[PDB]
Each structure stands twice: as structure tokens, then as C-alpha cells.
């Protein structure tokens, strides 16, 4: 894979550490440009980290913290753009990678051989009692010319004194004791006021649009682009989607035009991303923009005619920006809502809260608000749910959890600590992006019965699961799917919970035969749904009772025939 999405967990103890290694692999393996923040936290000594090998670029910040690991192999990493920064100021953060209390553990050598560039932000290296050479580096050289206010705060306390760097290095400047870890300079050595260079001479100066240095003066030859890679060439802006006429200023669509996606000019946006009016590939539309689905591809954003007719916002958006959970003080905002622009979080607060005081608990019946809901643009998180409810049937008609905002930057569907006995998400047929985490739900069966592969939309995605009721003991009680669930796939017991109903449907229920020849109301079939006839159509003996729904389309009228209808 070319690109991957990063995270935003940021020093939080991961709620199931047994998963945590699997998540990092699924997310960062194969990938070369980490869009988001590269967060390697709470990693054990042994941890196989070979999946981080190919990382060349980090859009955001790099956080290596609370790790017992001997070394992290980010050797190919050439640039961090610092799109956001840890603790407001730090593009790189190496914190608390020791043993507190083979022989020792903790971070020994940094090994950032290639890390030539840090556009925005500073560096923070503290409390790493086996970390060496942190001292030696000329950090000033690594920061870009523009930010260079870019402060550093390096702590140098150790429990071993270190080797010197291999004498091959010019000054004592290295990422490790090996000769191949000498910190070759780029910025602070060049001729004139060069952005960056491959050597101290004028021919050795890089193009204005190169970033992490270069292998020659051309705009092709950059180790990374400052602004955008345009089909092999570094440029300041992508070719716009629309040319304008000399006189009229009409939209003459650019044959060679591209969209901005990260640091790349792109012919069309990736799967879950929204095409923008301006021509970007965003995950949330701009101000004065409306989310629209067109007949041409995915959803796109648009400059509105009227101050865009408001559509039901969720958490992490507009007036619920910094609310952590759906509670009894905002449950009735979601009434009647077909689609929620944002996310939903259910916490132990929401059901057992009275903290801040006076705010009443949510009742199980108040949750039926969401029965209308078909789509969530963001994530679903549930760390708490009432005991009385055995499932998440409230979200029965939830179909698409897109996850353009993901929990801790990773998890779209998060279910933890619940005591629900089956899932119930019977309409759920897509997980747009992000990982699914279902864990420590003591009672939950019907997890090994959902074909999660069919929900996912890119190879990074996966389900992670532990400490739920195991399917050996579920099937031990004899809890299979219902007969009529094709390929035995279901979200719970009974005939309502199939993913594909193998025969015929009656609203919720999967069914062998409709009531076309015998039964209570007589029924016409349409797209495998048993829909009743008009009630005033006559019941027939050994025959079809109607063409369709209405009274004009009966075989015979039961009481009065007055065309065009029966009555």
C-alpha cells in the first residue's frame, strides 16, 4: 500500500493491550505515508515492529511513549510535516521509554537515519534512561528554515554512559553507535540562503519545492516535496479542476486537473473522502458547504444556495463539538433523524450520571430515538449500555458507519464492557473506514457469525476481539443462526437477524413463503418482500389474489366493484 491513516490516542492506556499490537500492524504495515499521527505507545519489550519499516513520511506528529522496546525501526522515515503537534508545540515526542523500577529494556538508540526534515514543531525527549545520542544531533539542522523558533527540550539523564559515535561521523553526531547512523546535514551547511542541499556548494543546492533534501537540482529529484507531488514533480499547487474563459469566466474543465489529497495531486479522491467544491479531498466539508450525494461517484461538498438547511449534528461537530457522550440533556436532539453528521458515544455517565449534578440518567426507552437512523458519518462508541437491553436493536436500521472521524483515530465501531448477549445491528452493511473493536463484553455471542470482511472497504481494516463470550461455548448452548439466513450469517438469534434473507421478507422477518395462495391477508411479492393486497380484494381459492398493493389491482372485489377501484 501507498498511504495509511494514523491515530489520535495520545498517552491513553489502551483499553485492551492484547489487541494493541495487532491494531498497529493492520494500520501501519506496507504503508509509506502516514496520514495522521504516528503513535507508538505502551509497547512491550519483545514487540515485533517490522511493519513500521517502510514509513517514509508522517503528516502529523510522532509520539514514542511508555515503551519497554529496545529500539523502534523508523530508519526510512524522511520527514514529519507537523500538521498537528503533540502538547501544542512538539512534532517529535520521545517520553518515558524506560524500565522505571538479555538484561535491561527501554529505548536505547533512536535510529532515525533518514529523518532529514521537520517542517513545523519542535522536539521533546525526556525520561528515557537508556537513550543515547539524543544529545549529539544538531537538531537546528533538522528543523525547517520557516519554523526554527522550534524549541527543543532534551533530557540527558541515563543509567548507562554511552559509546562515542563511530569516528566516520564528521562531528560527534549520530542516531546510534553504528557508522551508518551519522547525521548527514542538509540545511545549516548550504551556500547562500538555500532551503536545503545535498552538499555545501551551489550545484549541490536543492529545488525550492524539495523538502527533506534532494539528489540533484531538478524539481523531480526531491527526497520529499515541500507542498505537493504532481505526478513525479514537486510543485506549490496542483493544477486546478477548472480553467476560466478569457471574457465570460465559464467553467472549462481542465483535462490535466487534479485534486489536493495530503501532499499529493490526485486524479480523484480515495474511497471514503469527500470531493470538495474547491477541489480538495476532505473528511469534513468546509464552512458554508453542504454534504451531497451525486449520481456520478461518491459524496461531494457544495457552496449552498440558502444558509444550508441544517441536518442533525452529532458529537465532535458544531454545538456538540466537545461533548463526550450522548446524555439525557441531548438525547432528544436526534429525534426523527435519518442521518447523523458526527459521532455517537455512550459512556457510564450517560446511563449512570448525575455527576456535575442534577443531570438525570438516560432510560432504555429514550434510546428508541435512534430507530430512524440509517447513517453515521463519524464513529459509534459504546462503553456502557443498560442491563435490561440484551442488544443494540435501537440501531436496527443503522446501515453505514462511515467513520470519517474515528475513535482515538482508529476505531469506528467500539463496543466495550457491555453485557449485551447479541449484537442486533441487522441493517449494518458498511464500515467506510476504521477498525472494529469488540472486547470484554462478558455475555456477547454472535460475533463469529458476522462476515466482517463484507463490511470493510480497504485492506487496513479488521475486527479485533477478546474477552467476549467465546463461540465454542455459544454453540455449546446451541446458538446457531436461523435456517433462512443465507450462508449462516446473522447479527443475533431468530429470523429477523439474517444479513441476506435466503427466501422472502415480511418487514423484519425472514420467511419461507408469502401469503399468495393461502393465509391471513393475501399478499403480492415484489423484490422478495411479502406486501399485503388491498384489504377489499377478495380471497381466492387456489389462485393469485392481486397484481399489486391497490384496490384497482385485485382479481375480484370482495364486497363492491366500482371501477377503477374495489370498495
Amino acid at each position: 500500500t501507498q498511504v495509511c491513516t494514523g491515530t489520535d490516542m495520545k498517552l491513553r492506556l489502551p483499553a485492551s493491550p492484547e489487541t494493541h499490537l495487532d491494531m498497529l500492524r493492520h494500520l501501519y504495515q506496507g504503508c509509506q505515508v502516514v496520514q495522521g499521527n504516528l503513535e507508538l505507545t505502551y509497547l512491550p519489550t519483545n514487540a515485533s515492529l517490522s511493519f513500521l519499516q517502510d514509513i517514509q513520511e508522517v503528516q502529523g506528529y510522532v509520539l514514542i511513549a511508555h515503551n519497554q522496546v529496545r529500539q523502534v525501526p523508523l530508519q526510512r522515515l524522511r520527514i514529519v510535516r507537523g500538521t498537528q503537534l503533540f502538547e501544542d508545540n512538539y512534532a517529535l515526542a520521545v517520553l518515558d521509554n524506560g524500565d522505571p523500577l538479555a538484561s535491561p529494556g527501554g529505548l536505547r538508540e533512536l535510529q532515525l537515519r533518514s529523518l532529514t526534515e521537520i517542517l513545523k514543531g519542535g522536539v521533546l525527549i525526556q525520561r528515557n534512561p537508556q537513550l543515547c545520542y539524543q544529545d549529539t544531533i544538531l537538531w537546528k539542522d533538522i528543523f525547517h528554515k520557516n519554523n526554527q523558533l522550534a524549541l527543543t527540550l532534551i533530557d540527558t539523564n541515563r543509567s548507562r554512559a554511552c559509546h562515542p559515535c563511530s569516528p566516520m561521523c564528521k562531528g560527534s553526531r549520530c542516531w546510534g553507535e553504528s557508522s551508518e547512523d551519522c547525521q548527514s546535514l542538509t540545511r545549516t551547511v548550504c551556500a547562500g540562503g538555500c532551503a536545503r542541499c545535498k552538499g555545501p556548494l551551489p550545484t549541490d543546492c536543492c529545488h525550492e519545492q524539495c523538502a527533506a533534501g534532494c539528489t540533484g537540482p531538478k524539481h523531480s529529484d526531491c527526497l520529499a516535496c515541500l507542498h505537493f507531488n504532481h505526478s513525479g514533480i514537486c510543485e506549490l499547487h496542483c493544477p486546478a479542476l477548472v480553467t476560466y474563459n478569457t471574457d465570460t469566466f465559464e467553467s472549462m474543465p481542465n483535462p490535466e486537473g487534479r485534486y489536493t489529497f495530503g501532499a499529493s495531486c490526485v486524479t480523484a479522491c480515495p474511497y471514503n473522502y469527500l470531493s470538495t467544491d474547491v477541489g480538495s479531498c476532505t473528511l469534513v466539508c468546509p464552512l458554508h458547504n453542504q454534504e451531497v450525494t451525486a449520481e456520478d461517484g461518491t459524496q461531494r461538498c457544495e457552496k449552498c444556495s440558502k444558509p444550508c438547511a441544517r441536518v442533525c449534528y452529532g458529537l465532535g461537530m458544531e454545538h456538540l463539538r466537545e461533548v463526550r457522550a450522548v446524555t439525557s440533556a441531548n438525547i432528544q436532539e436526534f429525534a426523527g433523524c435519518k442521518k447523523i453528521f458526527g459521532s455517537l458515544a455512550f459512556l457510564p455517565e450517560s446511563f449512570d450520571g448525575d455527576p456535575a449534578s442534577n443531570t438525570a440518567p438516560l432510560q432504555p426507552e429514550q434510546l428508541q430515538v435512534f430507530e430512524t437512523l440509517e447513517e453515521i458519518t463519524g464513529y459509534l462508541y459504546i462503553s456502557a449500555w443498560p442491563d435490561s437491553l440484551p442488544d443494540l436493536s435501537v440501531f436496527q436500521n443503522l446501515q453505514v458507519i462511515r467513520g470519517r472521524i474515528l475513535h482515538n483515530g482508529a476505531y469506528s465501531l467500539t463496543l466495550q464492557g457491555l453485557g449485551i448477549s447479541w449484537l442486533g445491528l441487522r441493517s449494518l452493511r458498511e464500515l467506510g473506514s476504521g477498525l472494529a473493536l469488540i472486547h470484554h463484553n462478558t455475555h456477547l455471542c454472535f460475533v463469529h457469525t458476522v462476515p466482517w470482511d463484507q463490511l470493510f472497504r480497504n485492506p487496513h481494516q479488521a475486527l479485533l476481539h477478546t474477552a467476549n463470550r467465546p463461540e465454542d461455548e455459544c454453540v455449546g448452548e446451541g446458538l446457531a443462526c436461523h435456517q433462512l439466513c443465507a450462508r449462516g450469517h446473522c447479527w443475533g438469534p431468530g429470523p429477523t437477524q439474517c444479513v441476506n434473507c435466503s427466501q422472502f421478507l415480511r418487514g423484519q422477518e425472514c420467511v419461507e413463503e408469502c401469503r399468495v395462495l393461502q393465509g391471513l391477508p393475501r399478499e403480492y411479492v415484489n423484490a422478495r418482500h411479502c406486501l399485503p393486497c388491498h384489504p377489499e380484494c377478495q380471497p381466492q381459492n387456489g389462485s393469485v389474489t392481486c397484481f399489486g398493493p391497490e384496490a384497482d389491482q385485485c382479481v375480484a372485489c370482495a364486497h363492491y366493484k366500482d371501477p377503477p377501484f374495489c370498495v
Partner: antibody
Amino acid sequence: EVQLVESGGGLVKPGGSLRLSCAASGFTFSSYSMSWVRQAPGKGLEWVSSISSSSSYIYYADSVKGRFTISRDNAKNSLYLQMNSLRAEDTAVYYCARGGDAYNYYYFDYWGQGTLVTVSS
Amino acid sequence: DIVMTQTPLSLSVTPGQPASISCKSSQSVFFRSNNKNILAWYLQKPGQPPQLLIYWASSRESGVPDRFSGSGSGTDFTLKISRVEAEDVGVYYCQQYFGSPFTFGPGTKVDIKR
């Protein structure tokens, strides 16, 4: 004032060796980018080699590469040149010249008197 | 290899008359980063080593009098001497310090017309 006095020139049989040594005075030698320019008798000027202030950057011409080795001792205000596998072609004056500002611009602003090196059996 | 061309090889002029020497380079010597051409000019007076006349293709060194002035840009340059004096006798060289290998031109021999 500025002064570069070079030594160790003279006669060498083809294939043999010789070591030039240029002694600097009247500036902080640690902050300047030294070089050797040679001149065969009644010919133009040929760049031989260059070395940066701290010795962290070295270069050679293709005609001399491998055969010649440049070096310096900043503590002892001196610049050296180890010419091995010498040839008739290498016969020339060898001017020791100081550059401009450490390792960026090779102006050559002050030149030595130069030492004559002859290669004949 | 930035190959250096000088023309002419001989110049013979009466002192007081002005005189000029063109330098050409196979690849450009203009540096965008500091907006200067990275050429240098020297006078090798006979029975002496070379002396630096000009750096940055147009800026003089300390000691070098008014008459000596470099000009041009890109690949094509011209060293000028307004009012040649009888001691200016020598050979004039152009060097580039744009990149390895650092190359000189052939030289231009200036004769005083006595």
C-alpha cells in the same frame, strides 16, 4: 599578514612519490577552505584538490583521483598533499591557495609563491 | 565539468585605451538562492603567483583598483579594464566555483602597446 609558504617539491622519478606541505600564517587557519592549484610550465591553471575548514569535505580532479591525497593539521597551521604514482603530466608548479570562508565559496583570494615538482628519471 | 572558454587569447592595446576579455561557460553559473553568478577573475602578473581581481563575477577584492570591473550573467561574462596602465601586464584567468571540479579558463595574455 597573510602568508602561505610551501615546501617539499623537487625531483621525482616516474612511479615514485612526494609530499607537499604548505605552512600558513596571519589568519585563523581553522576557519578557511584550503586548496592546491598547479601550473605546468607556460600553461594555464589547473585545480588539483580542495579541503574544507574542519576537514569534513574533500574533493579531487579526475586526472589525480586515487593517486593524490589531501589533508590538514589545523592545530599546526599546515596543509599537506600526498602525491603517489607520479607521472610526466604532474610536472608543474603547485600553488597552495586559501579559499573563501570555510566550505562554500572557493574564490582562492590568497595564493602561495608555489613549489616546483619535476617528474623525470 | 563546467568547461570554460576565454576569447581572445591575445590582447594588445595602448595604455589609456580600454580593453575587455569575454568568458563563457558550458553550463550556467547563476545561483538563484543568493541571486549571483559564481565566477571569479584573476591576474597572474609575470614572476608572481595569481592574485584575485573579482569574486561573484562583479565584486572587487580589497586593493583592486577602479578600472577593473566584471560584468554579464548566466553563461556569458566580460571582464573590462577602463584605461589600461603600463603595469597591468599579465595573463587574465576566469574560474567558476559553482561546482566540482573547480575549472579555470585558458588565459588571455595582455600586452602593453609601448
